[PDB]
C-alpha cells in the first residue's frame, strides 16, 4: 500500500473534519482549491503557488510536516512466483497452481485460498435478471494477507518553524491529527480499492506514539494506545488539546500567519 494512498485517505478525513466544523462546502471548488484548507496546509502540505498577495509577492507552498511510508505485506513471493499469477489464464486451470505456489501452500488449495481468493462478480440486468451482457469480472482478493504496521512520521520541527516557534500553536495541529487517528481506529477511514464494494476496512489493534525531543507540554504523547478513543492519553492532556482545539474552532485563523 503506497504511502501516497495512506496519506491521501488521512488527508481526506482531516479536511472533512475541518470543513465539517466550519460547515464550509467543497462542491464549487476545483480540485486544487478543494485541497487548500486550514491546518492541513501545514500538516499535509500545499502546492507551490506564487501570489502577489499584498503588493508583496509570496509563495503559498509548503512541504508536508507529515510524511507516510509504503506499507508492505508480511507475506512475500519470489518475483517469478508472482509472474506466474499475473500470467495465469484459466481461473480454474493454470491459475490454481500459481496461487498455491505464491500463497505458500503448494499442495493445499483450501489453505491457498484463505490467503488470496479469486472472486467473480456479475452486474444483474434490472428487467431480466441473469447478468448484463459483458458485465462479468473477477478480483483476486487478498483476504488473508497480513500487513506490517503503518509508519507515520510527524516532523514537529517543521511545524514549529511554520508557526515561527510558538509551541502553543501546535495543539490545534496535534489535536487534528489525534482526531484523524481516532477515526482510523473506528473503521471510519477505509483504505485502497473498492472501499464501497467489499474491500478496504481495517482493524487497528494498537497505535504507538513515540516522539523524540518533544516540547515538555507535548511530552505526554509518548504512549502506546490500544483504546480507539484515545483514552490511553492522559485526560488532562486530552483536555488541554481539546481546549486549544476549541479555541481555534471559535476562530479558525491561518495559524501560521504571524
Amino acid at each position: 500500500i503506497p504511502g501516497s494512498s495512506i496519506k491521501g485517505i488521512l488527508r481526506t478525513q482531516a479536511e472533512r473534519i475541518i470543513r465539517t466544523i466550519c460547515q464550509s462546502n467543497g462542491s464549487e471548488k476545483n480540485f486544487l482549491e478543494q485541497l487548500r484548507i486550514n491546518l492541513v496546509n501545514e500538516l499535509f502540505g500545499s502546492a507551490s503557488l506564487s501570489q502577489k498577495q499584498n503588493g508583496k509577492d509570496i509563495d503559498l507552498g509548503k512541504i508536508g510536516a507529515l510524511a507516510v511510508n509504503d506499507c508492505f505485506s508480511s507475506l512475500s513471493m519470489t518475483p517469478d512466483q508472482w509472474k506466474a499469477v499475473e500470467n495465469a489464464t484459466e481461473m480454474t486451470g493454470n491459475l490454481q497452481p500459481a496461487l498455491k505456489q505464491a500463497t505458500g501452500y503448494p499442495n493445499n488449495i483450501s489453505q491457498a485460498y484463505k490467503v488470496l481468493q479469486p472472486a467473480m462478480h456479475v452486474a444483474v440486468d434490472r428487467w431480466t435478471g441473469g447478468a448484463a451482457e459483458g458485465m462479468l469480472y473477477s478480483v483476486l482478493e487478498p483476504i488473508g494477507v497480513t500487513w506490517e504496521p503503518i509508519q507515520v512520521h510527524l516532523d514537529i520541527a517543521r511545524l514549529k518553524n511554520y508557526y515561527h516557534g510558538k509551541e502553543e500553536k501546535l495543539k490545534p495541529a496535534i489535536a487534528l491529527l489525534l482526531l484523524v487517528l481516532r477515526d482510523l481506529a473506528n473503521k471510519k477511514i477505509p483504505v485502497g480499492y473498492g472501499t464501497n464494494r467489499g474491500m478496504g476496512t481495517i482493524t487497528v489493534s494498537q497505535i504507538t506514539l513515540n516522539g523524540k525531543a518533544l516540547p515538555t507540554e507535548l511530552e505526554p504523547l509518548n504512549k502506546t494506545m490500544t483504546c480507539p478513543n484515545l483514552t490511553d492519553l492522559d485526560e488532562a492532556f486530552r483536555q488541554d488539546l481539546s481546549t486549544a482545539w476549541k479555541e481555534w474552532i471559535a476562530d479558525p485563523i491561518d495559524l501560521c500567519q504571524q
Binding site: I17, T20, W127, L179, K188, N229, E235, S242, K246, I249
Partner: protein, 227 residues
C-alpha cells in the same frame, strides 16, 4: 419494470432437509422438491444445463454486517431504514438460486450498535477529544420512515403509501404469495417430470387462452392447463 423473485411462502417442514433424496416426484404436503433436478431412470441428471452445489448455508444461520452511510437526507435515510425494519414475515432475496426458493433472508437492525448523527451532531463530536454523548436516534427512526412514506405518497400521488403501485408490488415480493399455490416454472404437468418440457406449457398457452403474467400485487396464479 424491475423483476423480482417472490419469497417462497409456506414451503413444508423438511423441504430443505435430506436434500439428496429425489423427492421431486412426490407431493409432500402439496409441494414437489422443486429445487432438485429429477433423477432419470434412477440416475442423477448431471447434464450440462445445470450446476450442482456441494453444500449450502443452513437455514436459520445468522450474519452480522454494518452499513456506514454519509449525508443521507431524511427521505433517503427513511427509505433505507424501512427496508431494514419491514414488519414480520417480509424477507429479502439474496444470492443465487432465487427462482428455486433459495436465499430468503430476514433483515433487522441492532439498535444497540447503531450511531447516526446529523452534521450538527458531528460538529460536537469532532469538537472535543473527550468522550461526548451520542444522540439516541431510536426516537427519530419512526420520524425518518414517515418522511419517506409521505414523500412517496406525495410524488406518486396516492391516498395511501401502501397503495403506491411499486410499494404494493414490492410488498408482495418480500412477503410472498398468500393463495398457497406453489411457485415453479410454467409446466404442463404437476410433477416436475425428469425431461423438463417446460416449453409445452407455453405452446398450450399460445394455442389456448394466451394468459399474460398476472400483476404481482394481484396474487393470481397461472392454471396448469392454460387452455
Amino acid at each position: 419494470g424491475r423483476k423480482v423473485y417472490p419469497h417462497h411462502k409456506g414451503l413444508p417442514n423438511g423441504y430443505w432437509s435430506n436434500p439428496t433424496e429425489d423427492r421431486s416426484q412426490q407431493a409432500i404436503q402439496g409441494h414437489y422438491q422443486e429445487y432438485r433436478r429429477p433423477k432419470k431412470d434412477g440416475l442423477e441428471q448431471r447434464d450440462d444445463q445445470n450446476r450442482s452445489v456441494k453444500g449450502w448455508v443452513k437455514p436459520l444461520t445468522e450474519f452480522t454486517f454494518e452499513i456506514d452511510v454519509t449525508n443521507l437526507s431524511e427521505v433517503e435515510l427513511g427509505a433505507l431504514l424501512w427496508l431494514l425494519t419491514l414488519p414480520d414475515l417480509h424477507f429479502h432475496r439474496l444470492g443465487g438460486g432465487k427462482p428455486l426458493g433459495f436465499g430468503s433472508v430476514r433483515l433487522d437492525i441492532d439498535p444497540d450498535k447503531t450511531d447516526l448523527r446529523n452534521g450538527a451532531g458531528w460538529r460536537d463530536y469532532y469538537g472535543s477529544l473527550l468522550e461526548t454523548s451520542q444522540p439516541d436516534f431510536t426516537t427519530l427512526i419512526s420520524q425518518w420512515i414517515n418522511a419517506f412514506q409521505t414523500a412517496v405518497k406525495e410524488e406518486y400521488g396516492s391516498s395511501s403509501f401502501d397503495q403506491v403501485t411499486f410499494i404494493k408490488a414490492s410488498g408482495q415480493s418480500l412477503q410472498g404469495f398468500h393463495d398457497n399455490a406453489s411457485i415453479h416454472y410454467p409446466r404442463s404437468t404437476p410433477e416436475p417430470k425428469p425431461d423438463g418440457e417446460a416449453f409445452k406449457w407455453f405452446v398450450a398457452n399460445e394455442k389456448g387462452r394466451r394468459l399474460a403474467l398476472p400483476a404481482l400485487e394481484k396474487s393470481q396464479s397461472f392454471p396448469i392447463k392454460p387452455s
